[PDB]
Amino acid sequence: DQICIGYHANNSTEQVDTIMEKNVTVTHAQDILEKTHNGKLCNLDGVKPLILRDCSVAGWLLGNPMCDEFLNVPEWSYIVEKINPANDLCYPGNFNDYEELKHLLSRINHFEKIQIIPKSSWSDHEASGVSSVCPYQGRSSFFRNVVWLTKKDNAYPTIKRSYNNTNQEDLLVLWGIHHPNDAAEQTRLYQNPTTYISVGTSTLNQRLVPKIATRSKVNGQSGRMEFFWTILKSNDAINFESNGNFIAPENAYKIVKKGDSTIMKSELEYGNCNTKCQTPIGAINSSMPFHNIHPLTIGECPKYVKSNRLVLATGLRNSPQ
Amino acid sequence: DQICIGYHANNSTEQVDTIMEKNVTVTHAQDILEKTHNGKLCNLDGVKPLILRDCSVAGWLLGNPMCDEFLNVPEWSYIVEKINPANDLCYPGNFNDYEELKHLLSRINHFEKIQIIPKSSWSDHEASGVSSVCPYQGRSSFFRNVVWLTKKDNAYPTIKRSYNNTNQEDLLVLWGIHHPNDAAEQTRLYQNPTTYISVGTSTLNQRLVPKIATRSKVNGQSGRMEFFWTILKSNDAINFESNGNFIAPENAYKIVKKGDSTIMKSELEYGNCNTKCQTPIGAINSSMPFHNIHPLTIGECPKYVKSNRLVLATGLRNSPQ
Amino acid sequence: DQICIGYHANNSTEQVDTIMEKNVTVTHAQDILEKTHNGKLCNLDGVKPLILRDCSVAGWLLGNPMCDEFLNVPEWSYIVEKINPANDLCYPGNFNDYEELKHLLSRINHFEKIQIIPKSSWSDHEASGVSSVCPYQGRSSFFRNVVWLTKKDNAYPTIKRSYNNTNQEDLLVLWGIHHPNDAAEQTRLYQNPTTYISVGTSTLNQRLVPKIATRSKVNGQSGRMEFFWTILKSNDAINFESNGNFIAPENAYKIVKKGDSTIMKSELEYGNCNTKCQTPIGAINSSMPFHNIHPLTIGECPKYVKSNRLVLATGLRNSPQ
Amino acid sequence: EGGWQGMVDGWYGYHHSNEQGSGYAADKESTQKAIDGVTNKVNSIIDKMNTQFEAVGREFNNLERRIENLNKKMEDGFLDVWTYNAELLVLMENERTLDFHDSNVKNLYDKVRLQLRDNAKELGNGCFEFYHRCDNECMESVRNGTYDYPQYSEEARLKREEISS
Amino acid sequence: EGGWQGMVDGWYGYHHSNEQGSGYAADKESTQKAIDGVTNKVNSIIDKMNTQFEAVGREFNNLERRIENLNKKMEDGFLDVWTYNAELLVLMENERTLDFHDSNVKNLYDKVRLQLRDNAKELGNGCFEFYHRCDNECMESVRNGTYDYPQYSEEARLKREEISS
Amino acid sequence: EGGWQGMVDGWYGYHHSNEQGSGYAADKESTQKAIDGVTNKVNSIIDKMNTQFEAVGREFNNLERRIENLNKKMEDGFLDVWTYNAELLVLMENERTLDFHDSNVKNLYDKVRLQLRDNAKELGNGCFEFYHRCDNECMESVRNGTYDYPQYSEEARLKREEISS
Numbered sequence A, B, C: 001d002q003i004c005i006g007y008h009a010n011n012s013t014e015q016v017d018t019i020m021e022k023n024v025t026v027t028h029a030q031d032i033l034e035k036t037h038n039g040k041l042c043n044l045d046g047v048k049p050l051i052l053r054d055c056s057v058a059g060w061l062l063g064n065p066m067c068d069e070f071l072n073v074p075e076w077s078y079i080v081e082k083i084n085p086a087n088d089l090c091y092p093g094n095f096n097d098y099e100e101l102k103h104l105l106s107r108i109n110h111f112e113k114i115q116i117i118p119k120s121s122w123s124d125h126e127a128s129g130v131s132s133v134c135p136y137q138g139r140s141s142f143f144r145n146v147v148w149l150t151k152k153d154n155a156y157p158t159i160k161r162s163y164n165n166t167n168q169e170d171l172l173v174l175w176g177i178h179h180p181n182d183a184a185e186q187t188r189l190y191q192n193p194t195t196y197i198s199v200g201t202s203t204l205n206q207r208l209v210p211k212i213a214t215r216s217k218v219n220g221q222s223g224r225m226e227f228f229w230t231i232l233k234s235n236d237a238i239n240f241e242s243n244g245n246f247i248a249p250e251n252a253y254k255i256v257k258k259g260d261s262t263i264m265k266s267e268l269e270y271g272n273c274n275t276k277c278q279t280p281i282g283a284i285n286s287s288m289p290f291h292n293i294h295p296l297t298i299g300e301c302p303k304y305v306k307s308n309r310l311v312l313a314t315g316l317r318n319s320p321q
Numbered sequence D, E, F: 001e002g003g004w005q006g007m008v009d010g011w012y013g014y015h016h017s018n019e020q021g022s023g024y025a026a027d028k029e030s031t032q033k034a035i036d037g038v039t040n041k042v043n044s045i046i047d048k049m050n051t052q053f054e055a056v057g058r059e060f061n062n063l064e065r066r067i068e069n070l071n072k073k074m075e076d077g078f079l080d081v082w083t084y085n086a087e088l089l090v091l092m093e094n095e096r097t098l099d100f101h102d103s104n105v106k107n108l109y110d111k112v113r114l115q116l117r118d119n120a121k122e123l124g125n126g127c128f129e130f131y132h133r134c135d136n137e138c139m140e141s142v143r144n145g146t147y148d149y150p151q152y153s154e155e156a157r158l159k160r161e162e163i164s165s
């Protein structure tokens, strides 16, 4: 007669590693590494992303004629662009402190476009300014949130304009300057050969003089446009003075900003999903402490790790008799 | 007859956690987390902080009329401001590279105010310049380390001034420019309508032209002042040339800089204490390897941790018989 | 008769520490800390460093008359300068965005000097400009990659020059401006008292006006030179327009840039060695997971650690009988 | 020598073989304490991770490559810290868990060994060969700590005398 | 079954019960080695922390929020690394310490078990019930490893014969 | 009591002393498993380190000291994380390795203890003093698990009877 002492076995082929032993077959195990994603862009903690398909932030803000115009969400938790987007600046240029702008717009609690200076209020300047790299439906056109001012009759009187932010929300205001190719273009467009833009706030004290020089044609254009912005505080006023080259605000944006995220680059499509953690390759179900999906995550995420496998032995050695 | 083998017990209710078991009552234990602070701002490794009560670094450096003037310490290990300070720039403006200035002044081995250009040396310009946002005791006044120059008789001759740093210590020099609201103010104050400031060192090559524009009234003021600084090396000279809008140095600062700290924001008061680690909520006795007091620490600190409790079992299970 | 159970001993004096016990003598042990280096600067993953002996990156790029000229390597993995180098800017000045330039040049896949504007193509300006802080062999001389233009006869006609980058490689272009000491020097050198440099690319839109002011003599010089650069893309053109003070490109550099490293400061000499990890005190054989050589490492390095010793017990306690 | 397929109702236990037959019985006490110990281990490893909101993105331009590089050293820094610590943490806890089971088995063995004494012999395979006859009730009595050794002491002794002669 | 209030002079030890009375005696050797082992553990955990001067402050302006965010990822990064590693380090070392005590107790038990052999029986509670009479001197002799087993072997055998009949 | 110089051919083993002489014999089975276990430990500690290309350099100017300071907090941050974790990782694994050897020795001891039973007495020093005579073949038989206990049981009993009288 015999009585033996021993332990459980089963059909499990789950293997685990120890400090001292590799590939120990074990009865039960638990991977602590998250490896699966859902292949979709999702709301993040309940808030939809701002998805710009083939649009830059710059072209979206300026009201680019290509880009879709039902791209008005009251609020967003992160922004998604394509890896390489196609609708940036129709007229060659740049945006000043562009990266800080993108970062500030990456998460917005409230956003609302308002008209700040009607296009029709320019009585003694032409507002009809337009170019053949900014078509809208076939006619040479322009950005819709911003107006290219040019001389009327044969004159460009000094512009002196102010806007008092009466809203209790802070205002994102955009304007630019046009850098012509030569003095002939300068006076053709603005009459006055020598020209300035001055912009004033409780905080901002700006003076821009256009740079008139020979330049590389970019999309056939040798001129440049440079855009600028600020946040006009609740009861503050912005003051514009210019005698040429001024690309004026038409619309501005009420903005409430309580925190940040970033700009994601993803080819993916919006699913109708909710996640605590979004990746550019899909969303992730953020229960495990570690993941190996992608480093560029947004949300409350597990820690990114360079591993295939993190498997914790739970049951016993499976060496059956 | 019996002999038993066993272990010690006592009245201890100290609980510890293990990987496998929660809330094991134990005979003796040792918390490795520091959780207590002394509620005071202290010397840091023996050196007093520079405590600016309701003063900015900018207003303290410029010699702000509000701020206390016995705020002269030979040396300091960190700076403390209030969370929101009340005596910043009396006249609306800004300081150029302000954050780098604050950071550089955050820890100073030696600091000493010296007069570099007496107020009384301005023979053909008025030095008496003053404003009603910079009162001192009732009379409109100004910053004491810096002089507002204005026209005398009805003229502003070009200023051409140099200062050779004869000390063996490096010199922190401050100056500014005044951006008027319009050409009428410009010539009223300086006569010359068109105006520059030039500033030269072995390193610095600066040219400032004032920006004359319409602006938001801030404390009733539409003009702005902008301040600038450098470190004038031991045998180097600084050269000033201006025909208007120049806010001149009167006093500068001998500075010895051997390392950095930062600016702390704290409501607290100076105790008469010494610590290796200061927090904005109190000082900490830096023996344990981990703490949960506050993240913004200065000194040789334990590692900040998001925990209530880090308790190491030392004695035995306390399950009495 | 007896039979005993026991374990191996030997003459080993290797000591190890445990959590609970210090200085346990042990039969065999393995240090996991790398502590030795070879005292030489080495190729890094097979690619030689660019070793500038007593030359700055700036003076090397500008073609400094002191610096050696067989300092042409097709490719390099990191750059080494001395801790304090002696051949920087012969004429006092500075380089714009210098640190970004150094960083960009820290690792280059292909580099090749090409002549972009021959010295002999300046028909109506003098190219012979030279100074007594830039000797080469005894005659006052200058940088070889860059030309100091001055008036010819008694005139300085507007320069209008373009260069189309026909190569398929991107081009690093350098130019500068001369900031004279006064109007007399200005017209002596350039005739035209009032002067500009304009520089244009598909990306760059630059306007430089020289700053004419009184300044500290540095190496006997009160004037300054300021250098600038860009990367001219493959089929892009750069356009230069100036009526004075222009320090023109002669040679530029074809550049292929696939990744970064940094600038090492080392007194050491190049050995004929290959490493995966270089330190400024010598190269390291990167097998162990931890090292204590130096923090400023380049390559695939072990983790820097503040330790003398990381010794893993392998054998048994050595307490002989 | 190994594990047991047939012990389907617990982690640790007993196999008996007598004249009435043979089969497996689990010790549900030590099993359930193991199943709670290992569940705490996993839950501690998971629940001690503190995670907050982060947005990791590349938002530096081409004149900010030094800061982009700083951000890169940082990200790689954390990747390495996490990769190594998680990999080693798994390895270390696995050795601990597998030793924990071995410890539980050995304790169940000792409970039996002290009960039997010289009434059985140890085979060196985790089994005991009885000298006397151990019926189904006798086996149950060894499992639940109730084995009473005097009842078989006399019968068992003569049987080792029989072996020694 | 548990610990002992009455053993006030040491960590591990013995309780005896005979005709002359009962009481606790500590093993001061294994106790002091435990008290040094655990003091090294705590001291290692504390003293291996290298700390240098740092000034953590928020000194980026509102056109430097990308760098402020970099500094934030960093700070949170370190907070998480430290929080998790310190939490897990406590958990792991606690299991180790509590097992260390169990190991020390078990060793003290074995020293007795080899000494007594068949002169006593194991009760399965960490006690041994002697077959013979063990006076105060006999008890001391078991504690200090001096127990001499022949003196009681004959007396103890008849007494198991008495039990088996 | 300690280790053994004379056991030059293995890590764990046996020393025997009889009338024919004395000497050391290693258990090559448990030794080789130890020598593989400890080699895996070291290799895991080394091979789990993931290292990528980095260029750590100081490339911020004197109007970028806030960013230089950020880069400094970072570097010191990682230095501390690595220093503490590597120091503690060595300490923890060393205690584990030294306990692993103790565990292997104790198991080799138990294999002998179950074989001998009352035919030898435990001395409490890791040795067994036989009651009967154990020749060179008898010793080999104890090492390789072949010891047959009936052959000596009778001879050994009378010899404890001789001691008890």
Ligand SMILES: *[C@@H]1O[C@H](CO)[C@@H](O[C@@H]2O[C@H](CO)[C@@H](O[C@H]3O[C@H](CO[C@H]4O[C@H](CO)[C@@H](O)[C@H](O)[C@@H]4O)[C@@H](O)[C@H](O[C@H]4O[C@H](CO)[C@@H](O)[C@H](O)[C@@H]4O)[C@@H]3O)[C@H](O)[C@H]2NC(C)=O)[C@H](O)[C@H]1NC(C)=O
Pocket (backbone or CB within 6 Å): A164, A165, A235, A236, A237, B216, B217
């Ligand atoms: C955008 O428009 C806003 C108006 O819709 C501007 O804000 C207003 O500006 C006025 C004038 O600059 C300032 O207020 C005046 O009244 C205050 C009292 O304000 C307090 O009481 C108000 C009235 O009941 C409340 O509404 C306020 O919340 C607060 O409780 C007086 O103290 C001032 O007096 C001083 O200045 C005058 C003018 O010269 C002197 O003559 C006096 O002697 C005295 O010294 C102001 O007159 C205030 O800024 C604000 N008022 C309101 C109601 O909002 C805003 O400035 C504008 N932004 C810009 C940049 O222009």
Ligand SMILES: *[C@@H]1O[C@H](CO)[C@@H](O[C@@H]2O[C@H](CO)[C@@H](O[C@H]3O[C@H](CO[C@H]4O[C@H](CO)[C@@H](O)[C@H](O)[C@@H]4O)[C@@H](O)[C@H](O[C@H]4O[C@H](CO)[C@@H](O)[C@H](O)[C@@H]4O)[C@@H]3O)[C@H](O)[C@H]2NC(C)=O)[C@H](O)[C@H]1NC(C)=O
Pocket (backbone or CB within 6 Å): B164, B165, B235, B236, B237, C216, C217
């Ligand atoms: C702030 O003021 C300081 C003076 O108090 C200025 O420093 C002095 O400037 C002078 C003139 O620029 C320079 O020195 C001249 O003498 C040196 C020799 O210096 C060495 O010997 C000195 C004299 O004993 C010591 O004091 C020094 O430490 C050092 O050992 C000569 O070599 C120079 O000669 C050259 O230049 C002259 C002038 O044209 C030529 O004619 C000669 O042919 C020759 O080639 C200098 O004359 C030096 O800079 C310094 N001297 C002292 C004593 O400090 C400082 O420059 C000023 N700062 C600014 C920015 O203006």
Ligand SMILES: *[C@@H]1O[C@H](CO)[C@@H](O[C@@H]2O[C@H](CO)[C@@H](O[C@H]3O[C@H](CO[C@H]4O[C@H](CO)[C@@H](O)[C@H](O)[C@@H]4O)[C@@H](O)[C@H](O[C@H]4O[C@H](CO)[C@@H](O)[C@H](O)[C@@H]4O)[C@@H]3O)[C@H](O)[C@H]2NC(C)=O)[C@H](O)[C@H]1NC(C)=O
Pocket (backbone or CB within 6 Å): A216, A217, C164, C165, C235, C236, C237
């Ligand atoms: C540096 O020099 C380069 C030339 O060596 C410049 O690039 C060339 O510029 C020309 C003129 O600006 C542009 O190309 C013209 O031809 C394209 C077709 O290009 C496509 O076919 C080419 C010809 O076979 C291929 O070589 C190309 O790879 C590509 O496949 C036409 O579509 C354009 O037509 C439009 O513009 C003309 C001019 O006014 C209008 O009249 C027409 O009606 C039409 O709308 C161009 O004419 C092109 O940029 C490029 N060509 C080549 C061969 O490289 C480069 O621009 C220069 N850099 C700068 C900054 O100046």
Ligand SMILES: *[C@@H]1O[C@H](CO)[C@@H](O[C@@H]2O[C@H](CO)[C@@H](O)[C@H](O)[C@H]2NC(C)=O)[C@H](O)[C@H]1NC(C)=O
Pocket (backbone or CB within 6 Å): A015, A016, A017, A022, A023
């Ligand atoms: C057992 O150990 C081996 C080492 O020989 C591990 O080998 C790796 O296995 C992975 C997983 O599929 C392969 O992708 C790798 O190529 C292997 N590495 C090498 C160097 O060969 C193996 O993974 C271990 N197996 C398990 C299941 O844990």
Ligand SMILES: *[C@@H]1O[C@H](CO)[C@@H](O[C@@H]2O[C@H](CO)[C@@H](O)[C@H](O)[C@H]2NC(C)=O)[C@H](O)[C@H]1NC(C)=O
Pocket (backbone or CB within 6 Å): B015, B016, B017, B022, B023
């Ligand atoms: C024993 O475990 C429990 C889990 O049930 C721990 O619960 C936390 O206790 C803290 C400390 O006071 C409370 O603040 C938390 O609210 C509890 N968490 C939850 C989810 O209930 C408990 O702390 C443990 N006790 C000790 C003393 O270590």
Ligand SMILES: *[C@@H]1O[C@H](CO)[C@@H](O[C@@H]2O[C@H](CO)[C@@H](O)[C@H](O)[C@H]2NC(C)=O)[C@H](O)[C@H]1NC(C)=O
Pocket (backbone or CB within 6 Å): C015, C016, C017, C022, C023
């Ligand atoms: C044994 O422990 C002692 C502590 O008393 C360690 O002491 C250090 O030894 C180093 C190494 O040579 C010396 O540089 C230090 O000065 C010692 N520190 C102190 C505070 O005295 C000792 O290193 C340990 N020895 C070994 C070999 O591991």
Ligand SMILES: *[C@H]1O[C@H](CO)[C@@H](O)[C@H](O)[C@H]1NC(C)=O
Pocket (backbone or CB within 6 Å): A011, A012
């Ligand atoms: C064990 O695993 C296999 C594979 O899925 C499964 O089909 C089989 O039924 C399992 N056996 C038991 C007893 O659950």
Ligand SMILES: *[C@H]1O[C@H](CO)[C@@H](O)[C@H](O)[C@H]1NC(C)=O
Pocket (backbone or CB within 6 Å): B011, B012
């Ligand atoms: C145990 O703890 C209590 C609570 O403070 C204390 O008053 C009591 O005296 C302690 N007992 C002993 C024996 O120290």
Ligand SMILES: *[C@H]1O[C@H](CO)[C@@H](O)[C@H](O)[C@H]1NC(C)=O
Pocket (backbone or CB within 6 Å): C011, C012
């Ligand atoms: C042990 O170490 C010493 C010191 O080098 C060496 O000379 C000696 O020969 C070694 N002994 C053996 C047996 O290897």
